[PDB]
Amino acid sequence: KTFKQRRTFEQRVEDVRLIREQHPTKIPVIIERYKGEKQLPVLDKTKFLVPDHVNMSELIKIIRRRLQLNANQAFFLLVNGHSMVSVSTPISEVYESEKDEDGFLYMVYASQETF
């Protein structure tokens, strides 16, 4: 059902290696709905190439636009299983500290801070 479940560690690693070869300025991001989530829709896809210069505040804006949310729908984004200490950090920096061992950066969204 989830991404890690669909693809072998081997497959996720080789894919990250190809994105490096072909999309060298992009951060390979996995963005998934919380398995409890009722209110927000599922994304049209799972794997995203995020320009390495955008900060987390702008990545939240991007996903809210992708979900076609309105002003007073709530949106919370976990990175590597936990809260973001800051939304102002560039995603290149966030990748280097919060990346998975397979080389993706893993995010999960919900309408409550209680995931």
Residue 23 makes contact with Cl ion by CB under 5 A: yes
Residue 49 makes contact with ligand K9N by CB under 6 A: yes
Beta strands per DSSP E along 17-80? 26-33, 47-51, 76-79
Beta strands per DSSP E along 6-102? 26-33, 47-51, 76-79
Please give the Cα distance from 64 to 74 (Å, whole number): 10
2 or 25: CB nearest Cl ion: 25
Among 2, 25, 97, 112, binds Cl ion (CB under 5 A): 25
The full length of the chain comes to: 115
Residue 57 makes contact with Cl ion by CB under 5 A: no
Residue 48 makes contact with ligand K9N by CB under 6 A: yes
Q: What would the two tokens of residue 113 be?
A: 């801070």
51 or 90: CB nearest ligand K9N: 51
Residue 33 three-state SS? strand
10 or 21: CB nearest Cl ion: 21
Please give the Cα distance from 29 to 16 (Å, whole number): 10
Residue 62 makes contact with ligand K9N by CB under 6 A: yes
Residue 43 makes contact with ligand K9N by CB under 6 A: no
List contacts with ligand K9N (CB under 6 A): 26, 48-51, 62
